[PDB]
Design a protein around this ligand. Structure first.
Ligand SMILES: [Ca+2]
Ligand SMILES: [Ca+2]
Ligand SMILES: [Ca+2]
Length: 138
């Protein structure tokens, strides 16, 4: 009855991204900028990170960044557009980012996740955020 949770945060790195809405175009922009201090998820001692972008509760339709080979501090600087997306639907979504290590001979390795409800963002301007990656394990 004091707070939701308290505890140690696993050091999974952090990610920077921006989001904003253009009302004339009815377009939501999400820019996945860069990540820092990602863990190594390959026996080579690096990872091959990419980001999956969801607008929850839509768990089916996602976008993805490119894979940055052997890079624990990737700079994607990739811009994604959700064009002709009505504003009244936008504010009902949660922007969800999942960072993974791309693998060749096994399944990709999830690293961590972040999210932000778009109804808590002032989308009239591009807003930029840093968030520490949280565990995305089941
Ligand atoms: Ca791996
Ligand atoms: Ca890998
Ligand atoms: Ca793997």
């Amino acid at each position: 009855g004091i707070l939701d949770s308290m505890g140690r945060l696993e050091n999974l790195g952090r990610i920077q991204f921006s989001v904003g809405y253009n009302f004339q175009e009815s377009t939501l922009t999400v820019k996945v900028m860069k990540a820092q201090e990602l863990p190594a998820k390959d026996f080579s001692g690096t990872s091959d990170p990419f980001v999956k972008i969801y607008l929850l509760p839509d768990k089916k339709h996602k976008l993805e960044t490119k894979v940055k080979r052997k890079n624990l501090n990737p700079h994607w600087n990739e811009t994604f557009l959700f064009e002709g997306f009505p504003y009244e639907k936008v504010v009902q979504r949660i922007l969800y980012l999942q960072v993974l290590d791309y693998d060749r001979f096994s399944r990709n390795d999830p690293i961590g996740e972040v999210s932000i409800p778009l109804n808590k963002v002032d989308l009239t301007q591009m807003q930029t955020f840093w968030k520490d990656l949280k565990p995305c394990s089941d």
